[model samples]
Target chain A: LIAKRAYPYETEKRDKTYLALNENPFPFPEDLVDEVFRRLNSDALRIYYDSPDEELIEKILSYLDTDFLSKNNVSVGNGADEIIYVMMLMFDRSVFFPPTYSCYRIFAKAVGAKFLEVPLTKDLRIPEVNVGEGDVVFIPNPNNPTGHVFEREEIERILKTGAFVALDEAYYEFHGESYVDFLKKYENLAVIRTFSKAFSLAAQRVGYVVASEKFIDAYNRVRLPFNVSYVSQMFAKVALDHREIFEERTKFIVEERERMKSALREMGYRITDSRGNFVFVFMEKEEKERLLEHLRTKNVAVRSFREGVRITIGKREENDMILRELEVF
Target chain B: KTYLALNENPFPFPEDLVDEVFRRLNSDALRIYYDSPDEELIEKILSYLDTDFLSKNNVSVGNGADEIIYVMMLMFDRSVFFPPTYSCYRIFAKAVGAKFLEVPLTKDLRIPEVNVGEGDVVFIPNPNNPTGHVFEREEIERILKTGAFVALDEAYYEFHGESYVDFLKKYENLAVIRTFSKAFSLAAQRVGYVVASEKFIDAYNRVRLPFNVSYVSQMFAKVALDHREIFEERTKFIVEERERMKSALREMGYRITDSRGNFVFVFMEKEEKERLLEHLRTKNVAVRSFREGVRITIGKREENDMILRELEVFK
Candidate 1:
């Protein structure tokens, strides 16, 4: 369908300062990718590979600290997208705080899940509400559009509702904090993490959820075996082996983010005290359109929310270019 | 000395083409899941079909023809196929636990008069697996015309060189399955495709694993599709080998089935087939032994010659 419809931006004449897909401007630290590829075992390439290698599950387990309960631990599926889709099949109710992730509704509709969209409080805190006994709540911590990390108390309040909460910690590495600590306190909490944003393994399709063993077993039972490829597992595993490098990069992106946030504030943009890899530039829809058009002219790419624009902090140069474009516009 | 089993082609693909195709996959491309067939590959396949009969949307792909069979089982309510056909049909039937019924082919290996209807899915492989027999087009239309869900496994379609993909335009319930493993020397690559109504394709897409095939496999299949000259050369060699084996075996008074596939089946007494299998094993030749016959996978010229020499001992 995307091919049938001729879109304006994706065409050839479009300028190529690709802030477009939130990709790492650096092409996978060339030496690292090539070295990893070269060292790949020939035998590993043959035979039907297990989707998420057993070692990967151990790697994920190690990442999920002691505070995380085993009952809330599970890993299977091509990506978090597959996990999210399958969760719809496992649980009947998909309850989320709205203007959360737009995909919650779109994917729910696609997968035919019954979902309840509850709006957040004016302060972007979890609204004092009920999601019933058996609903699953997907909350992107350091939320995507607002970039506000819900407080410990706020999470505790939701846990009391007796509903399963799928905490999307897609940006947990940037924030350096996680609800992973509360797994011991709550049986119904499942944390979703991705190597896409922090480790830059999006194309490798590595996304995992840390839930209880019960949840993991059930998920494994239904999902296709060897769903994620050997290539995906290796890419993620190698990058993970060099976690210190990623930690340093995360520090760099965070510093760049602070600069982007400061500039947006100076420009009269209602920028949230964002802590994810990107800063949210909140503005009116009309203002968003004008800014987006202006940015497009400058070959800048970022996600546009109903409230504002989302600019990812990657290389130092890309951030500077975006700020300079904003200054002129 | 004879390695005749599994019915693989007699020739290995050109080394240069294999290297050229594989050398191109970078880490990122090799890592990601490709849900669609390579554009050129699809076009080449479509050319083998009726243009007015199919479109890009009419088709989808899977890991291999086996996976196409697997996914089709998931998409339908109940799977109905024929016995003395593909063994994988039963494996997949039980694997997915889809409600299934198999109608035995006649003594000549044609589908029996079984009334398949709405909510029932039927799989018929023309130039069928195991036996290499092609049923009449009218008989195929009778099943397609049933308005029940129908999957035509044409794994050997290339050897027969005909397509009933046009039947899909006439009947919405019809879906034609095709594969690269048998004819295109890409079994290791595992590329399979299906031609069906857009609605069924869409429904199948909804439930399919998003990353179905590795990009490396898809690219290899694409290159094979592009160089039709190479594919034709390979096919011609295989057909010739198949006919040569059949004629040679017939001269020995072996009961060959006039098999169109790359393999030949010798229908002999079960005890005799078993004893022949033991003798061939001793001679270091491994042909597949079935209930009533033994299947000889046609290999290269030398391999065929070795098999004939070994067979003389049994005679």
Candidate 2:
């Protein structure tokens, strides 16, 4: 029975200063929100409007800017979360590294699918494992929790395993490198991206994946038709039409991220040199508890793991609040 | 992530609701990963379907009624659905490569003879699609007797006026699916809900996307429920129009289902269908066509009249 499956994590809206989900510190541009309403038609909302119309496909293709791919190779999920959930079904074995996307484990368990969680090596590299055909490997580049980018040769080694590899590029905008072109050489490679972090449309629930034609075809069949809302798709398209603002906004987060990385070490904490818009701080068990207690009392809410805490890069003022909290802790 | 839905409301979601959705937008609403059925939103949805038998734990939400169907397919032992029912039952079953049995509805348009016991999920669309006709409550009770779970799809329920939700008091095996896409005209908002046992709802919450629907989309459903009298009036208008078209088509010697939905269904042969389709196309009119018949959404007066005038010669 489904009741036997593990319960998935639900993000609760809390009263503390929130920075856990790697949400873009910048608010969605108001002018763009109005533009979405101005361009939105009542009829589009009334009828069962098919999402990712040719224009959206074209726009996503434009955003990818990778000439080797086209509409047939791309598909969308309600969010990268759905894409991850759906892919767990497509393979016999699901494989990922911890200090990786937690949903890979949660979704695999939810499906009762046999999955393997291999920890990253001491160097935070993909661990050498005996995985091959029928296994779909999930590795988030510029990884979650600790946003360190994995090297190209390691991913290339995994591609040689004859297994399908899902390269999650949700934070691509922050790190500025993509394995998306690997699709041209390795049919087994697919890249997943989202507007949640980069475009500030997490609530809009827009995410896209580009892979081989066969993979896209299978994905489309498995997913609900009209999977993305017309408004969400429209919001994504308009967001694409105005990429400059998001790109500019991302620069601010990255800079704030680096500033925190430097300040944390200066405060006697062990932090990863995260290239994405977040910093990971690992501390001794007792140190972590006192820190959580202090932050909780200070009404600061950053994400905590057994090993450490992840602080998302917020506005300069918010970043300073976190830094100022750590200085005396 | 990107995806889909099938039937939607005949009328546009009210502009007032649209403005309210935008009004609720704030930084956290977009930036933070939001709870799709925020606690209060679920309370409102439960109140809209209130029964002493129900509570917050008894309900859950999904991207659309379709996602609920898709995830439920993952929960069952074997999928059993009637043909000419919602098409996705088969499509979704095949997506997971799950085994499903498609028993065509009897010529009278009711459940057919089949063996479905505890591990079987029987999907029934009340005021069924394409035909837009209701399957009797007794017919559904028979399925529930087989120890089979009944996923009673009530996507079009608001258009039908009566529902089997009260049956939930007895049948723990039953779950009713509903959507804002239909009566509330919030199709693009991508919000839908399920009323099931606390156990089933918990299982459902685990399998589907936690942030399945948008916070903004959730608000549209919230406001629609709060301002339900407005949509009730609008559903009345569409139901009246549907009857008007059904009656008109029957008088014209057209074969029509006695549908009680916001749409009417017409049956025609291939030759007659093409001629009718071609004629309507020439006039820039479109209706959903199936192998057995065509489903037409009831539109404003002149739009319905235009199809009426076309079928005069085409029928």
Candidate 3:
């Protein structure tokens, strides 16, 4: 019977210009890498070091720079995905709207957690569904696959149902907006953020979530004691400390993205106004296949969803290459 | 921290190898979602283990051996472990909010009788923690014969030198976990690997974070595996040092555990345990305290000598 269980959502493993994983194309700047190496304090690894003391916690809260939150309001993860996996375990049944962050279903199905997935309305709003106490809802704002933001009321409506909501903001830094305020107003809400996207520390595998103290306490007890490594927390801390470099990088991504959105639309691809680090183009079935065929032949792989294709905003060359493929196709 | 609180390798992971780890970490490794047990890592681990039966499918890595225990807890109906073992089986089981059984080990520190059917998983640490001692193959075979899954934690395997990973061929339910943090002096890096059946590895891989370990952490494991002799010699030294610590403590009328791992465990009454910790406190030295006894890692001679002198004065 144990052998019958299937591991959900194994991503494609390939050698190509990888715009598929929604990864930041820029190399972690060597200077910052040097600082992470310098600040490593080697002995931190020799024993099981604490992951959530004033050190990384303060850095995260300060980065969030919100007065409503403090160290008690935040908890760390191996990555945001781990937090999703953990939050699901704490609740009775997992709830989400897909194509949400696809992992919600993958994690729920993996853990054998009772789950409910309702599709969004044609206008892209969360469909009306009754849920309460034992349910946890995972909603990635400025959502994945179709990179667009959710209305404030769309999120509030779920919380109003007296359900726990994990607002996954993995792309928050890219979006330049967050629902962190809801964490204060609604005890049920938690905002999950990561250095993997905006901070270009995907390799480091560091992510944190801002939630109420009680929910945080729930997380700490359930998560592995040393969830994030010593090296990763430093990379995150320094990346947060030097905000301008990444801020400048973010603005450039926005500019390149604006150009990308404009260029793709001019070519008659139906791309949404994405606040995420990637773009989602809605296409007909045949168009989607033909386009993917071009990327496949060019050995440039991006993500494809039920509705469309989602390509990451890569470097000039990588982004330019996608445009070229899109142009000819 | 003039210490031995956690069972860490006292030797500093060499900067040369640390540089080597960084050398291997290029932009590609850092930026993308990596295969957790990348081909090179699993192959290097295979070479080190000398287990010809094990293939890439049979191996998986964790953030640490701790993560392996935590994830394994979820895969079963319940978790079962004997007392005076690695603390996390109980801790992790409780954390997962799963039902668990804590049967006491026999007076000789071996597995005791308990009911664990197909849905239950038992976690056993070889060259065990707190009371560093090993379990015989017969005791392990007895538990596996009951049709429950067995998580044989060989965390301290390098220091003690025995493994039931070979048991995997006979039992589909058996998994062996070991770590770079112990002998390789890399608790900071947090890389641990487990070898089990392909199906179990696939399930374990799905349940855990895809990039559970940092890029540098995996690189550290890779580099450490390549430099096995460096850690092999160091482990030999520590095992010899542990014997000296055990004999010294025993000679001074302390009932120390016949520990084979790189640590010596002392059985103490509440009064003596409190008194000895206070003495070690006075000297600013540290070792782990448990409900039953104290587990002290074997540090360098100077550190071990300091501990012995403090024990002598207290005795």
Best by DockQ: 2
Q: How do the predictions measure up, each by TM-score?
A: 0.71, 0.95, 0.96
Q: State the lDDT at A160 in candidate 2.
A: 94
Model 1 TM: 0.71
Write candidate 1's Cα lDDT for A1-329 as tens digits: 11111111111222455553344434445456655555444433323456667777776766665644443375755566667766765677898886686667756654456888888887788886667567888888988767778888887777888888888887888897898766666778777887766676665556887876666776665554555655557766777777777788788878889888888778777878888888777778866788889877667667777777777775788788878777764
User: Candidates' lDDT values, in order?
Assistant: 0.70, 0.84, 0.84
Q: Measured by C-alpha RMSD in angstroms, how accurate is candidate 1?
A: 6.5
Give the 10-residue window scoring lowest on summed lDDT in candidate 3 chain A: A3-12
Q: Could you tell me the lDDT of residue B199 within candidate 2?
A: 79
Two-chain DockQ for each candidate model: 0.13, 0.63, 0.61
Candidate 3 residue lDDT tens string, A1-329: 48645554264666467787888777777777778777766556677767775688998878888898988898898888888888888899888888788878877876677899999887678898888878998889989877788989889989999999888999887877798998777888889988888777787788898999888988898888888887778888888778888888888788888889999999888888888888998888987899888778778878888998898888888788887788886
The sequence of per-residue lDDT tens digits that candidate 1 reaches over residues B113-179 is 8778877789888777677777788888787777777788888887776767777767888888888
Candidate 2, position A303, lDDT? 86
Q: In model 1 chain A, which range of ten residues has the least summed lDDT?
A: A1-10
